Amino acid sequence: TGCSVTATRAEEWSDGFNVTYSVSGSSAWTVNLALNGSQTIQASWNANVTGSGSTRTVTPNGSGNTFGVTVMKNGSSTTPAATCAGS
Numbered sequence: 001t002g003c004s005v006t007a008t009r010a011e012e013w014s015d016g017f018n019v020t021y022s023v024s025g026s027s028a029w030t031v032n033l034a035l036n037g038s039q040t041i042q043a044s045w046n047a048n049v050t051g052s053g054s055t056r057t058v059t060p061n062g063s064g065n066t067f068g069v070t071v072m073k074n075g076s077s078t079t080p081a082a083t084c085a086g087s
Contacts, residue, residue: 002086003029016042016070021082023065031058031084037076044069
């Protein structure tokens with residue numbers, strides 16, 4: 001009974017990959033992004049993403065259920081983890 005966000009690696013290179021999490025189920029949802037290792041958030045869009053350490057809270061703008069952000073592989077080309085909840 002909550003938002004069902006999903007992940008999907010889109011772009012990628014020897015520095016970071018543009019992950020694309022697709023939200024589906026509701027508009028008022030929250031996808032807590034969690035980079036891996038020392039990864040970091042180089043950029044994002046389709047949603048207000050922000051953080052300060054190893055996790056960033058994602059939020060829908062009103063027409064971008066699916067968001068996308070660059071993942072500073074920094075020695076890690078694995079996709080980050082994302083969770084959601086109905087509020």
